[PDB]
Amino acid sequence: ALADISGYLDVLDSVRGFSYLENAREVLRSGEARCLGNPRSEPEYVKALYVIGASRIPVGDGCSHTLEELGVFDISVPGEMVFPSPLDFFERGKPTPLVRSRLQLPNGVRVWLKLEWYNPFSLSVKDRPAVEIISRLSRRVEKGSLVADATSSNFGVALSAVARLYGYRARVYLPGAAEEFGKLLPRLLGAQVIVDPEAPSTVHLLPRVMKDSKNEGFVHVNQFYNDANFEAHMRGTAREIFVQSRRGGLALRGVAGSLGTSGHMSAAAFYLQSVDPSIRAVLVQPAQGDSIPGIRRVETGMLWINMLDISYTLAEVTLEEAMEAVVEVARSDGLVIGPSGGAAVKALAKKAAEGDLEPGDYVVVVPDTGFKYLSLVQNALE
Amino acid sequence: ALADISGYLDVLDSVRGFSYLENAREVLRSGEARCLGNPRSEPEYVKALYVIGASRIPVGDGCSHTLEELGVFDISVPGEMVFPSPLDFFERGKPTPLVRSRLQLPNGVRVWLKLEWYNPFSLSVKDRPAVEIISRLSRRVEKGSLVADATSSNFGVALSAVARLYGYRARVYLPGAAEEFGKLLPRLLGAQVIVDPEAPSTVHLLPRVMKDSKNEGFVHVNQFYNDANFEAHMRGTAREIFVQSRRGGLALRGVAGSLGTSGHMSAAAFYLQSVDPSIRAVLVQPAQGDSIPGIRRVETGMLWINMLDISYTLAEVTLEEAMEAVVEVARSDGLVIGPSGGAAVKALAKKAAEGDLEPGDYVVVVPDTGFKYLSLVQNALEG
Numbered sequence: 188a189l190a191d192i193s194g195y196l197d198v199l200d201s202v203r204g205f206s207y208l209e210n211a212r213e214v215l216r217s218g219e220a221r222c223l224g225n226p227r228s229e230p231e232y233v234k235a236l237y238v239i240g241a242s243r244i245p246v247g248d249g250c251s252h253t254l255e256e257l258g259v260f261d262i263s264v265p266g267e268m269v270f271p272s273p274l275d276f277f278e279r280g281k282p283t284p285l286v287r288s289r290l291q292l293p294n295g296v297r298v299w300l301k302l303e304w305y306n307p308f309s310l311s312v313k314d315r316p317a318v319e320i321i322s323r324l325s326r327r328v329e330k331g332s333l334v335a336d337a338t339s340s341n342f343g344v345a346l347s348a349v350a351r352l353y354g355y356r357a358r359v360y361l362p363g364a365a366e367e368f369g370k371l372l373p374r375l376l377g378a379q380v381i382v383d384p385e386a387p388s389t390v391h392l393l394p395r396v397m398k399d400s401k402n403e404g405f406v407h408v409n410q411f412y413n414d415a416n417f418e419a420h421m422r423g424t425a426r427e428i429f430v431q432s433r434r435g436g437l438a439l440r441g442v443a444g445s446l447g448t449s450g451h452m453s454a455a456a457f458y459l460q461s462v463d464p465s466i467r468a469v470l471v472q473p474a475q476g477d478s479i480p481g482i483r484r485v486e487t488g489m490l491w492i493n494m495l496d497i498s499y500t501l502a503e504v505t506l507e508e509a510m511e512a513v514v515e516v517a518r519s520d521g522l523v524i525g526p527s528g529g530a531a532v533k534a535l536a537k538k539a540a541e542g543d544l545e546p547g548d549y550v551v552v553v554p555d556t557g558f559k560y561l562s563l564v565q566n567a568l569e
Numbered sequence: 570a571l572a573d574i575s576g577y578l579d580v581l582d583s584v585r586g587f588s589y590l591e592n593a594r595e596v597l598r599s600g601e602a603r604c605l606g607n608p609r610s611e612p613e614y615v616k617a618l619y620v621i622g623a624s625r626i627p628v629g630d631g632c633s634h635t636l637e638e639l640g641v642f643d644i645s646v647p648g649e650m651v652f653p654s655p656l657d658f659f660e661r662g663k664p665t666p667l668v669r670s671r672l673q674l675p676n677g678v679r680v681w682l683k684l685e686w687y688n689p690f691s692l693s694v695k696d697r698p699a700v701e702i703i704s705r706l707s708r709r710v711e712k713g714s715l716v717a718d719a720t721s722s723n724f725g726v727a728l729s730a731v732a733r734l735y736g737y738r739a740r741v742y743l744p745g746a747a748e749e750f751g752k753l754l755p756r757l758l759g760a761q762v763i764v765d766p767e768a769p770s771t772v773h774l775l776p777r778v779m780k781d782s783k784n785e786g787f788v789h790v791n792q793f794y795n796d797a798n799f800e801a802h803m804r805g806t807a808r809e810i811f812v813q814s815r816r817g818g819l820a821l822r823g824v825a826g827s828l829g830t831s832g833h834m835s836a837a838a839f840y841l842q843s844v845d846p847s848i849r850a851v852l853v854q855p856a857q858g859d860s861i862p863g864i865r866r867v868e869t870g871m872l873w874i875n876m877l878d879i880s881y882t883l884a885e886v887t888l889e890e891a892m893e894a895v896v897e898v899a900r901s902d903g904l905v906i907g908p909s910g911g912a913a914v915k916a917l918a919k920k921a922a923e924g925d926l927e928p929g930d931y932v933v934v935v936p937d938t939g940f941k942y943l944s945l946v947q948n949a950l951e952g
C-alpha cells in the first residue's frame with residue numbers, strides 16, 4: 188500500500204552516514220521498493236526513498252511498489268505556471284529546462300543543456316542545497332539565529348534569500364576575487380557580507396568561518412561538508428535528469444559537469460549509475476593556474492565525489508577554453524551560459540573528440556547564467 | 570467544427586491595419602467565435618483568432634466554439650520540461666511564472682508577479698517581440714541579411730539571439746546611457762553594436778538607424794512601430810495573464826506595468842479589457858528628470874497605447890521609489906526584480922492607497938531580473 192512520505196521525514200534528522208545509499212541504489216536499479224510492515228523501524232530505507240525522489244512509501248507485508256507508484260515520476264509543475272509563493276515555485280516549478288543544443292561535436296555525441304539558472308532565488312544551481320540545508324535545521328535551530336558560510340557568489344545569494352524566507356539571518360564570507368554580484372546581492376537580500384581581499388580561494392575562508400562560529404555562536408551550514416547538499420541534488424537535479432531523459436526519449440549515455448562542492452555532479456553520477464552503471468560522468472578540472480568562478484580541481488578536497496562509489500572521467504579545461512565554449516553556445520543556441528557551464532561543455536567536447544564516448548544523448552549541467560560575468564565575456568571577445 | 574489554424578497562417582502576410590482587432594475583442598468578450606463558411610474569405614477573423622492565442626478556427630455554417638475549444642487555454646508547459654531545440658524552448662517553455670508576492674498593499678490589493686526573465690535568450694520580456702518580428706520576415710527576407718534597430722539593452726540582446734536562430738545577422742544601436750550588459754552581450758551573441766554617447770535616449774537614435782538602413786540596405790525591424798511586437802504580447806504575455814488568472818483561481822481586477830515601446834502593456838490592457846472592461850491597467854510614468862532603464866513617459870511618443878481602444882491610469886514614479894520597491898520585494902519575497910518591475914509595483918501601490926482599485930488580484934509584469942542592475946542596487950542600499 189501507499190502512504191504519504193511527508194509524515195516520515197523525521198528520519199532526515201536521525202539517519203547518518205552513507206550506508207542508506209545502498210537502498211537507494213538497489214531501488215533505482217530494480218525499479219521497485221519493498222513494503223515496510225513498520226516504516227518507523229527502517230529509517231535508512233525511508234531516507235533512501237526520499238533521496239531518490241519518492242513522495243510516497245510502500246507500507247504492508249510482502250507487497251512492493253514501483254518508482255512510478257512511489258511518486259518518483261509525478262508531475263510537479265502546474266501547466267499554467269501559477270505559484271502561491273516563491274518557495275512553492277522553487278519546489279514545484281521543476282524540472283529545470285533540458286534543452287538540446289545545436290553544438291556539433293564529433294562521434295555522434297548529442298549535447299543537451301540543463302539550465303540551472305531557472306532557480307528563482309540565485310538564478311543558479313545553488314538554490315537547491317540552500318533550501319534543503321535551511322529547511323532541515325528549521326526544527327532544532329531557533330528562528331532569528333544567524334547562519335553563515337564560506338562561498339563563491341551563488342550560494343551566498345541563495346543562502347541569503349532562503350535563510351530569510353525561513354526566519355533566519357545570514358552572513359556570507361567571500362574571497363576578494365568573487366564577482367561583485369556575490370558581494371552586493373546578499374546585502375540587498377538582507378544578509379551581512381564579509382569579503383577577505385587576501386583569501387586566494389573560497390575554501391581558504393573555511394577556518395575563519397569555523398573560528399568565528401565558535402566565538403559568535405552562529406550556525407556554520409558548511410555546503411562543502413553538509414550532506415543535505417548532496418541529498419538536495421539527488422532528489423532534484425539528478426532525479427530530474429533521469430526522469431527527463433526517460434520521458435523525453437533520450438538515449439542517455441552520459442552527463443557532464445563541473446565541481447565546486449561536488450554536490451550536483453556526485454548526485455548525477457550516483458543516481459544515474461544506479462540505474463545503469465555504464466552511463467558516463469565527464470567532469471571538469473580547471474587547468475592549473477586558471478580560476479573559473481564557482482569551481483575547483485578535485486585534488487583540493489571534495490567530499491561526495493571521492494567517498495561515493497561512482498565512476499567518472501576528468502578533462503582539463505582552461506578559463507580561455509571555457510569561455511570559448513560560452514561564445515560557441517551563445518552563437519549557436521542564443522543561450523548565455525556561465526564560465527563553469529562552458530567548462531563542462533568543453534570537457535564533453537574533448538572526450539567526444541578522443542573517441543571515448545558512445546554516440547547518444549549527453550546532459551551537460553549548466554550551473555548559472557552568463558549574464559553575471561560581463562568582465563570574463565569582455566576578455567573572451569578580445 | 571474545428572480546423573487547425575496552422576493551415577491558414579498566410580493571413581499574417583496579407584492582413585494589414587487594426588480593424589481585425591474588433592473581431593479579437595468580440596470573441597474574447599463573448600468567449601466564443603462563430604463558424605466561418607469559407608475561412609479563406611475572412612482573413613481578418615483568422616488573424617484575430619491567431620492574435621488571441623487560438624490554435625484552431627471554427628468552420629461550418631451556424632455553429633460556434635468557445636475559447637477553450639479554440640485552444641486559447643491550451644498553454645501548458647510540459648511536465649518534463651524537455652525541449653528538442655532553443656526555439657522550441659522559447660515556444661513551449663511558457664507561460665512565464667506568475668508568483669504571489671507577500672507584499673502588503675492597502676485596500677485588499679493582492680500582488681502577483683509575472684516573471685518575464687524566464688524568457689530563454691535575453692532573460693527579458695523582449696524575447697517575445699524579437700521572435701515574432703524575425704519569424705514573420707523569415708520567409709520574405711533572404712538569409713544572411715542584416716536586421717537592425719534602436720534599442721535599450723534588452724531588445725538588443727533578444728534581437729541578436731533570435732536573428733542568429735533564424736539565419737540573419739544583427740546590428741544593435743544603443744544610447745550612451747545604456748547598461749554595459751546591453752553593449753556587450755549582443756557582441757557575445759555575434760551582432761554588431763553601435764553606441765552613441767551623445768544620444769540622450771533610445772528613440773532619439775531612430776532617424777540615424779533609418780538613414781543607415783537606406784544607405785546600407787539592412788532591415789530596420791523597428792520595435793517601436795512594428796505590429797508584430799503588439800501581436801507577440803497579445804498571443805503571449807496577455808493571453809498568459811488571462812489564462813493563468815483563470816486556471817490559477819485569481820480574481821483578476823487589474824494589471825500593472827511599464828512602457829517603453831508600449832507593446833506589452835497595450836496588449837495586456839486590450840486583451841483583458843476585451844474580456845472585462847473593468848479590469849484596470851495601471852501604468853508607470855517615470856518622473857520628469859529621472860531615467861528608469863527600458864522605460865519612458867507616454868508623452869515622448871507611443872503607438873499602440875494611443876491608437877487602441879483601452880483605458881489606463883498613470884502613476885508617477887521616481888527612480889528612487891522604483892528602487893525602494895526592488896529592495897522591498899527582495900526583502901519580502903526573496904526575488905530580485907528590475908528597476909522597471911519595481912516601478913510597476915510602486916505604481917500599483919500608489920493607486921491602491923488612493924482607494925481607486927477594486928480589492929482582488931493584480932498582476933505586475935516584471936520585465937527582467939534586477940541581478941543586472943548592480944550600480945542601481947548599490948545606490949538604493951545607501952538609503
Ligand SMILES: *Cc1c(COP(=O)(O)O)cnc(C)c1O
Nearest residue numbers: 341447448449450451481527554
Ligand atoms: C556551486 C557552483 C558550481 C559547482 O556546483 P557544486 O554542486 O558546488 O559541485 C559550478 N558553477 C557555479 C557557477 C556554482 O555556483
Ligand SMILES: *Cc1c(COP(=O)(O)O)cnc(C)c1O
Nearest residue numbers: 723829830831832833863909936
Ligand atoms: C522593453 C522593456 C520595458 C517595456 O516593455 P514595452 O513592451 O517596450 O512597453 C520595460 N522594462 C524593460 C527592462 C524592458 O526591456
